């Protein structure tokens, strides 16, 4: 429960300046969050895809 609350402090305060690059969304699942919550966090962001057909 402290881990989950700490993630929320990370996300709302620290993440403005600090990265957490070694942690994937799947890492939160079954530690701080359910699969659905973590998928929802991931789905709100945009990531680089492979280039389209015109490259």
């Amino acid at each position: 429960a402290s881990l989950r609350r700490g993630y929320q402090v990370y996300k709302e305060v620290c993440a403005a300046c600090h990265s957490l690059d070694r942690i994937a969304w799947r890492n939160l699942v079954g530690v701080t969050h359910t699969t659905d919550e973590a998928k929802a966090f991931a789905e709100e962001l945009e990531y680089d895809d492979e280039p389209d057909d015109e490259g």
Binding site: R26, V29, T35, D36
Partner: protein, 75 residues
């Protein structure tokens, strides 16, 4: 009066004969069990072993029927 001793040669091969080997047949049995138990124990962690062998054993078999809740599974 006895003219000759009374005996036969039993069939043998590589210094084994059937009387002797027959005494060891049960021992091969137990060693086979030991090797079976040991092998199965070694691969008890393999999921297929659990799915196909261990979970089918009556009573005891439920020890190996374990589901991860869908909420706790990233994959």
């Amino acid at each position: 009066y006895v003219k000759k001793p009374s005996y036969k040669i039993v069939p043998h091969f590589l210094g084994f004969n059937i009387p002797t080997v027959s005494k060891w047949i049960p021992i091969f049995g137990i060693w086979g069990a030991a090797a079976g138990i040991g092998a199965l124990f070694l691969i008890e962690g393999v999921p297929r072993t659990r799915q196909d062998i261990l979970s089918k054993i009556p009573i005891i078999g439920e020890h190996w029927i374990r589901e991860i809740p869908a909420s706790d599974n990233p994959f």
